[PDB]
Structures are given as C-alpha cells and as structure tokens.
Amino acid sequence: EYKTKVSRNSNMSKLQAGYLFPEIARRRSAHLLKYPDAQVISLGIGDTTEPIPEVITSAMAKKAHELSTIEGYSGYGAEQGAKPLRAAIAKTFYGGLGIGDDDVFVSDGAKCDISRLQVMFGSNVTIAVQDPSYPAYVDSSVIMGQTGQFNTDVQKYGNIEYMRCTPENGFFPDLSTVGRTDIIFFCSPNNPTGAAATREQLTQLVEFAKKNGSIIVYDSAYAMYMSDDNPRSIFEIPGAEEVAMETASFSNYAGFTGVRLGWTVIPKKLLYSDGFPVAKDFNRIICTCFNGASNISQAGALACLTPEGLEAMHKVIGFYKENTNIIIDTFTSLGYDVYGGKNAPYVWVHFPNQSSWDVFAEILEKTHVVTTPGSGFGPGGEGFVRVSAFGHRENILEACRRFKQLYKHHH
Amino acid sequence: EYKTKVSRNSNMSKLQAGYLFPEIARRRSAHLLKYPDAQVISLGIGDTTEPIPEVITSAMAKKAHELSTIEGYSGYGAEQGAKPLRAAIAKTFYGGLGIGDDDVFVSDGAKCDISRLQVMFGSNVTIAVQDPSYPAYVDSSVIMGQTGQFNTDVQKYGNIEYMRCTPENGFFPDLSTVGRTDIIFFCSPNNPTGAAATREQLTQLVEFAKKNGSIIVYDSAYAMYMSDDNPRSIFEIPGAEEVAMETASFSNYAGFTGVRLGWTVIPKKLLYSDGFPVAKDFNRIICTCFNGASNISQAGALACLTPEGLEAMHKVIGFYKENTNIIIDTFTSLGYDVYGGKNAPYVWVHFPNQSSWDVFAEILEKTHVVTTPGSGFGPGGEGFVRVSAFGHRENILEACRRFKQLYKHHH
Numbered sequence: 001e002y003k004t005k006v007s008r009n010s011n012m013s014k015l016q017a018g019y020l021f022p023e024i025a026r027r028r029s030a031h032l033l034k035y036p037d038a039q040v041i042s043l044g045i046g047d048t049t050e051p052i053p054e055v056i057t058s059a060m061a062k063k064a065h066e067l068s069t070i071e072g073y074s075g076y077g078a079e080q081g082a083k084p085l086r087a088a089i090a091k092t093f094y095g096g097l098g099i100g101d102d103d104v105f106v107s108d109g110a111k112c113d114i115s116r117l118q119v120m121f122g123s124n125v126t127i128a129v130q131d132p133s134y135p136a137y138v139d140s141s142v143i144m145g146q147t148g149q150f151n152t153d154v155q156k157y158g159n160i161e162y163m164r165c166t167p168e169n170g171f172f173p174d175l176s177t178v179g180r181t182d183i184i185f186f187c188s189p190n191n192p193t194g195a196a197a198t199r200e201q202l203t204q205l206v207e208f209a210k211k212n213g214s215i216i217v218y219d220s221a222y223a224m225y226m227s228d229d230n231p232r233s234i235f236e237i238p239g240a241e242e243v244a245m246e247t248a249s250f251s252n253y254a255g256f257t258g259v260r261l262g263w264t265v266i267p268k269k270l271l272y273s274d275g276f277p278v279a280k281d282f283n284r285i286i287c288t289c290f291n292g293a294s295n296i297s298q299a300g301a302l303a304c305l306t307p308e309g310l311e312a313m314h315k316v317i318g319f320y321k322e323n324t325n326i327i328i329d330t331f332t333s334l335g336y337d338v339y340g341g342k343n344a345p346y347v348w349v350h351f352p353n354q355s356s357w358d359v360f361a362e363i364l365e366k367t368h369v370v371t372t373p374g375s376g377f378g379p380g381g382e383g384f385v386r387v388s389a390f391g392h393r394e395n396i397l398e399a400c401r402r403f404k405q406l407y408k409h410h411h
Numbered sequence: 412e413y414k415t416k417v418s419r420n421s422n423m424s425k426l427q428a429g430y431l432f433p434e435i436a437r438r439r440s441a442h443l444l445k446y447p448d449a450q451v452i453s454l455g456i457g458d459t460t461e462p463i464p465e466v467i468t469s470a471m472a473k474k475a476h477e478l479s480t481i482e483g484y485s486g487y488g489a490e491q492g493a494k495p496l497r498a499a500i501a502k503t504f505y506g507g508l509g510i511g512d513d514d515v516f517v518s519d520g521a522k523c524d525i526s527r528l529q530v531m532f533g534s535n536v537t538i539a540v541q542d543p544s545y546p547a548y549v550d551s552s553v554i555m556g557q558t559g560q561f562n563t564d565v566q567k568y569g570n571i572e573y574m575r576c577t578p579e580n581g582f583f584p585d586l587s588t589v590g591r592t593d594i595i596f597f598c599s600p601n602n603p604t605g606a607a608a609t610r611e612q613l614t615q616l617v618e619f620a621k622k623n624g625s626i627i628v629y630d631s632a633y634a635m636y637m638s639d640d641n642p643r644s645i646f647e648i649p650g651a652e653e654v655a656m657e658t659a660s661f662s663n664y665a666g667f668t669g670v671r672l673g674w675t676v677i678p679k680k681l682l683y684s685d686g687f688p689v690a691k692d693f694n695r696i697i698c699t700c701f702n703g704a705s706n707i708s709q710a711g712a713l714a715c716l717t718p719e720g721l722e723a724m725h726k727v728i729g730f731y732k733e734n735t736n737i738i739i740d741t742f743t744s745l746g747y748d749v750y751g752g753k754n755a756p757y758v759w760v761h762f763p764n765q766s767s768w769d770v771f772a773e774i775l776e777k778t779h780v781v782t783t784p785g786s787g788f789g790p791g792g793e794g795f796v797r798v799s800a801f802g803h804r805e806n807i808l809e810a811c812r813r814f815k816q817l818y819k820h821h822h
C-alpha cells in the first residue's frame with residue numbers, strides 16, 4: 001500500500017482514546033446489535049429530548065421562508081453574529097455587568113468555541129481544569145500541543161493542572177494547592193458533578209487568576225439550571241472583566257443541541273501581557289476560521305430572547321429539573337451517595353469498589369440504560385457514574401424503576 | 412491598566428493585517444462617509460444575492476416545524492453528519508469514484524473545514540498554495556504555526572511554497588519548479604483566477620503529490636460552474652485516493668452563504684508516513700472540536716440533492732453564469748485581458764502596470780463599485796482585480812455601464 005511522506009501530527013498521537021461521547025454511542029450501538037429488541041433508555045450523553053417550543057421553531061421557519069424572497073434573502077452574515085442577536089444576548093444575560101454588544105461573539109455552539117479559543121491561545125500556554133470536567137477542555141489542549149503524553153499511572157496528560165474537586169471539598173478546589181497556569185477552564189454548574197460555585201468561591205477564583213495573571217474560560221452552559229442563589233455569570237464578580245471570558249449555549253435551554261447556537265463573551269479589559277486585547281485576536285480567529293452561525297439558527301436564538309421565548313425555555317428547563325429530582329430520589333432511596341442534581345440536569349452517583357466503566361457496562365447489560373462513566377471526565381471521576389436527566393418523563397420513570405429493581409436487594 | 416501574564420500567541424502576531432474581506436468592508440464604509448449619497452454596488456466578496464429556491468427553503472421550514480413535535484424532534488446529530496446526507500453527497504458528486512458514505516464529513520462550511528484540517532495537520536507541516544489563491548489557506552497556516560514571519564520585500568510568509576499561476580503558464584503551476592511540501596492546497600476552478608485545471612494538469616498534480624509524498628487539499632467549491640469539459644472532482648484522477656482529499660460547499664450553488672453547509676471527503680487510502688489513515692484523525696478533530704452542522708441546514712442540503720433541488724441549483728448557477736458573461740463582454744469590449752469567467756462566477760481582469768489596491772480604490776472612488784484587489788490573494792495577484800458576478804441582474808448591468816464610462820479612453 002502507498003503511504004504519503006507526511007508525518008502524522010504528534011499531538012493527535014498523544015490522545016489516549018477516542019472522544020468520550022462517541023465511545024458511549026458506540027457501546028449503545030453494540031448493545032443494540034447484541035439485543036436488537038432491547039428497549040434502551042439513553043441517559044448517557046446529555047442530549048435534550050423534548051421538542052423545541054413553537055414560538056422558537058416558528059421564527060426559524062419564518063426565516064427559512066424569507067430566504068426564498070428577494071426582500072428577505074440574506075447571504076454571508078458578520079462572523080461575530082447579527083447585531084440584534086448580540087444585543088439581545090448582552091442585555092438578557094449580562095445587563096448591568098458592563099458587557100457591550102461588541103463583546104459578544106455568536107457561535108454554532110460552546111464546544112466549537114472551546115476549540116477556536118484554543119487555536120487562539122495556541123500551543124505555548126498551560127492550562128488548568130476541574131477534575132472531573134467535561135472532556136473537551138483537556139482533549140482540545142492535547143490537540144493544540146499544550147500538553148505532554150498521557151500518564152497511565154495517574155490517568156493524566158502531562159503539563160495539565162488537574163484541580164481536585166471532591167465531595168469532601170464541596171467540589172471546589174483548594175486553590176492554595178493549585179499551580180499557576182496561563183488558562184483556567186472553569187465550568188459552573190460543573191459537568192459532571194453538578195456543583196455550582198458560590199459567590200465567595202468565584203471571588204476566590206477571580207482573585208487567584210488576578211494574582212497569577214491567568215485567563216479564566218468560564219463555561220456557563222448549564223447556568224439557567226441554577227436553583228441555589230449563586231452567580232450565573234463570572235462577570236457578576238468585580239474584577240472578572242480583567243481576567244475572564246465566558247462561553248455559553250442555547251443547547252440546554254431551548255433544545256438547540258442539533259440546531260447549533262451559542263456565544264462567547266470577551267470583555268474589553270482582558271489583555272495579554274503585552275497589553276494586546278484578547279478579543280481582537282478572537283475576532284481574527286472568527287473572521288479567518290469561521291463563517292458565522294447559521295442565519296436560521298440565529299433567528300431562532302433571537303426568538304428565544306423575548307418574553308414568550310424566555311417563558312418557553314423556563315418551562316423546558318423546569319421539566320428537566322423535575323426529571324432530575326426523580327433520579328436523585330431513586331438513587332438516594334437505594335442508599336447511594338448522590339451529588340449534584342440541584343443546579344444541573346444530571347446526577348453524579350458514587351459507586352465504591354468498582355471501576356466506572358465496569359458499572360457503565362453492567363447497567364447497560366442488565367437494564368438497557370445508558371449512563372456515562374465518571375472516569376470519562378478525568379481521573380477524579382473514577383468511581384462515579386453520571387446519569388443525565390434529559391428524557392421523556394415516561395423514560396425517566398422507567399429507567400428509575402429499572403435501577404430500583406436491579407439494586408434494591410443489594411445494592 | 413491591569414494586564415494578564417499570558418503571552419499573546421506568537422502566531423497571531425505574525426499576521427500582517429486583518430483578514431482581507433473585513434478590510435474591504437472598512438474601505439467601503441469610509442467611501443460611504445465620503446459619498447453619503449452613493450449607490451454602491453458590491454462585486455467584491457463573493458456573496459450570493461438571489462433567493463434560495465423554494466423547494467430547498469420549504470424543506471428547511473419543514474424541519475423547523477418538525478422540531479416542535481415529539482416524533483420529529485432531534486437533538487445532537489453525529490458530528491460527521493446525517494447518514495442520508497453523507498450518502499446523497501457521496502452518490503451525487505462521487506458516484507463511480509469509489510467514495511463511501513463514511514468518507515464524507517458534513518461541515519458548516521468549507522472555510523471552517525480548511526481551519527479544522529489545519530488543526531489536524533498541525534504546526535509541523537509545510538504547505539504549498541496557488542499564488543494567487545483564497546487567503547484562508549495562507550492565513551490558517553500562519554495561525555497554526557506552519558510559517559515564518561512575513562517578508563515585505565517579496566510579500567510572502569516564510570516557509571510557504573507559493574506556486575505562481577500566471578497568464579504565461581495558463582494559471583497552472585510549473586510543477587518542475589515547485590519545492591516539496593507536506594500539503595498542497597489546490598482550488599479548481601481557482602479563486603480568484605477562475606482557472607479550471609484540465610484532466611492532464613490534475614494528472615500532473617497527482618503524479619507530483621505521489622512522487623513527493625504530499626497530501627492535496629482540493630477545493631472544489633466552484634466546480635458546478637464548470638463549462639469546459641474538465642474534471643469536477645480530484646477523485647476522477649486515478650491515484651488521487653492515495654494523495655488527496657476534497658472540500659466543497661453549498662454556498663455558491665444554493666445561496667447557502669448564510670445557511671452554512673459544506674463537506675469534506677477523505678478517502679480510505681490516504682495515509683500518513685506511518686500508515687495511519689488521515690480520515691481517522693479528521694474524525695477525531697470533527698468529534699472533539701465540532702458538534703455537527705445545523706440540523707435545519709442539513710435538511711436543506713438533503714433537499715438540494717434531489718431532482719427538484721438539482722434543477723433549482725442549476726438555475727441559480729445558470730443565472731450567475733449569465734451575469735459572468737455580461738461582465739466578460741464588458742471588459743473585453745473595453746480592451747482588457749480578462750481571465751476566468753468561463754468556469755467560475757467571477758472574472759480576473761489584468762490591470763498591468765498598476766497596483767491592485769490602487770485600481771480597487773480608483774474603481775470604488777469613481778464608479779461606487781466594490782471589487783477585490785488581486786494582491787489580497789497573494790503576491791501573484793498583484794496587477795489584477797477580481798470582479799464577482801454575484802448580483803441582481805440590474806445591478807450587474809449598472810456596474811458594467813459604470814465600467815464602460817470609467818474606462819472608455821483607455822483603449
């Protein structure tokens with residue numbers, strides 16, 4: 001067989017396995033080949049299940065129709081996003097926090113922004129992450145060449161600061177033990193633990209970043225699930241404007257997981273060590289590596305940020321929060337230590353004396369329910385399993401009845 | 412002012428100026444301040460102007476409506492794209508060329524794929540580009556760290572092989588003079604020259620890549636504009652499957668510039684020097700750095716690849732080809748050497764003994780028509796101006812009458 005003389009990217013070689021979520025999808029698919037008539041309930045991947053509200057879909061359909069008319073047709077959009085959408089995001093989520101329309105960059109989703117930010121930061125920065133956390137932060141770091149190899153003793157990529165988050169520390173790290181890095185990826189409410197940082201904790205985080213001269217990338221993808229009275233934006237913390245940016249999405253708010261619309265906010269006062277504004281480099285990346293979010297998706301997002309849109313999103317969110325309560329109650333009644341579920345649409349269940357992959361496989365084989373192994377979220381996730389609350393009500397109820405039946409005589 | 416201690420990405424510092432098209436927008440705005448009553452006609456950026464065909468927008472509106480129903484709702488899609496869409500692309504454009512559904516990756520656009528491919532290849536590859544060519548190839552290369560500094564004497568970034576395409580070589584590189592690189596970006600029909608490589612030329616290109624052990628990234632985003640009997644896909648050349656991938660888009664075919672939908676094809680036989688299949692690394696990038704194209708945009712693209720959709724796209728393309736003929740005839744009658752136009756919806760006009768930025772400024776100043784200076788596409792573009800044929804018919808006719816008024820005394 002012929003091979004080129006092009007050397008494979010050594011950063012790709014570093015990755016220890018495939019990306020987590022397609023591996024879960026693969027295992028689900030394998031299970032269905034084994035048992036074609038299994039009534040599988042999927043609570044692994046955090047995939048929304050309920051329909052998008054009609055007020056929002058009607059806006060998208062209207063835009064689609066408009067694109068077939070002379071007056072209503074539009075081509076390329078500004079890569080940063082339509083001005084009225086940037087304005088709506090700025091006022092709805094950041095009104096009173098000193099965020100301008102020009103500080104908002106509309107994306108086709110938070111996952112995509114994480115990687116474009118990583119291209120922007122480049123190969124020479126060091127990163128810190130919560131341990132456990134959503135695996136895109138670590139994997140994008142590896143891809144960009146910010147890391148060393150995977151160390152199998154500790155299950156960590158070299159040169160990444162893994163900030164230990166545990167039940168005993170309330171899932172917020174002891175910052176006195178955290179080494180200095182250039183970037184700190186911080187998710188609140190955290191995926192997978194569900195932990196929402198308090199105002200006091202976020203104040204610590206901003207103070208830590210300021211003293212270390214670090215940039216915080218704050219992922220607020222689940223913030224509208226907040227029930228406790230905690231900040232939903234990092235910009236609620238005075239001084240955050242000098243050290244932080246925020247990335248978020250409509251995925252979990254409007255069921256836009258397939259529609260694709262999010263945003264990143266980079267404040268004017270966020271500067272590199274040479275005084276160059278970080279937002280100006282992000283703008284160059286967005287203008288060079290991207291051609292903007294879909295015009296139909298943008299029209300949908302604009303409809304979200306209206307009284308009817310916000311009401312509709314609130315209802316969807318509330319439904320999933322009720323699902324979460326059902327799941328918490330099930331695992332609590334079975335005698336497990338259960339974390340999260342208060343401020344986020346997933347629950348974080350401790351399974352002592354078992355590997356999380358083994359628990360995942362057992363649950364899938366015996367109950368035909370898909371979950372996510374905690375170790376997929378980093379070494380601090382070992383011994384835990386994440387259960388998503390996204391599902392039709394009857395599916396959540398059925399999954400819980402299956403869990404109870406499996407575990408009630410043990411557990 | 413507070414500054415972080417994070418160093419600006421030194422690859423971002425290498426960039427000479429902003430991205431070309433935002434720079435043109437800036438000059439258009441300045442022109443409007445100078446002439447507030449000017450009736451500006453834009454033939455600069457290749458932005459489609461005519462409405463999307465109803466058969467296609469109807470499918471998109473239908474998908475939007477379906478998302479508000481239990482049965483019709485879908486959340487995350489596989490990052491690679493819906494299987495029926497992958498299948499439709501593979502058969503419609505590559506049937507008989509040995510391309511499988513699994514070799515096709517659906518994107519939110521060709522521009523985005525260029526940069527995801529560059530993340531995949533990484534910082535250690537060297538690239539070759541046509542000179543002139545679409546500026547994203549060079550700029551993405553600089554951003555990824557594949558280059559040295561910009562040299563102002565020659566107007567080139569160090570470490571890029573600029574393959575000069577000129578009237579004297581029929582706008583195809585003299586490959587015997589081209590140095591070996593890892594990657595060869597090759598656009599046919601070329602943007603900005605309009606030149607479509609012949610079967611013989613593409614055969615030379617594949618042979619060159621095979622002997623050098625290079626990967627060709629073949630950009631076919633204007634291939635449906637082909638009028639001459641030339642190959643529309645690199646995979647028409649036997650052996651291409653060992654050295655080439657292809658990237659394309661619906662932007663210029665269906666007016667999807669704002670809708671966002673393209674694809675990349677990477678064949679099974681394309682391997683790195685260690686035998687590792689390139690498609691497997693692209694798949695990792697697509698699954699880690701992307702969350703899939705918009706579901707509504709995918710529904711639109713599926714509708715394009717039907718008898719009614721293909722007929723509709725043919726009509727759209729035919730309209731722009733007629734605009735192109737109007738422009739060609741205008742410049743030819745004025746005594747200019749006009750290139751391109753035959754196989755692409757833009758024309759490449761030779762303005763010898765002038766700087767292209769000066770010609771751009773002159774045309775904009777005197778006729779209120781925006782064009783694109785050739786030097787924006789690299790140093791080989793100096794002395795030419797690209798004129799886009801995307802416009803309403805009356806706007807094309809008017810721009811041409813303005814050109815005739817400006818240039819009547821030149822020949």
Ligand SMILES: Cc1ncc(COP(=O)(O)O)c(/C=N/[C@@H](CCC[C@H](N)C(=O)O)C(=O)O)c1O
Binds near residue numbers: 487
């Ligand atoms: C903290 C956090 N940030 C960003 C995202 C992705 O948001 P988006 O691209 O806007 O849909 C997510 C989504 N995570 C889901 C969905 C994972 C599968 C999806 N395909 C993905 O890779 O994001 C999960 O953890 O189950 C997230 O948790």
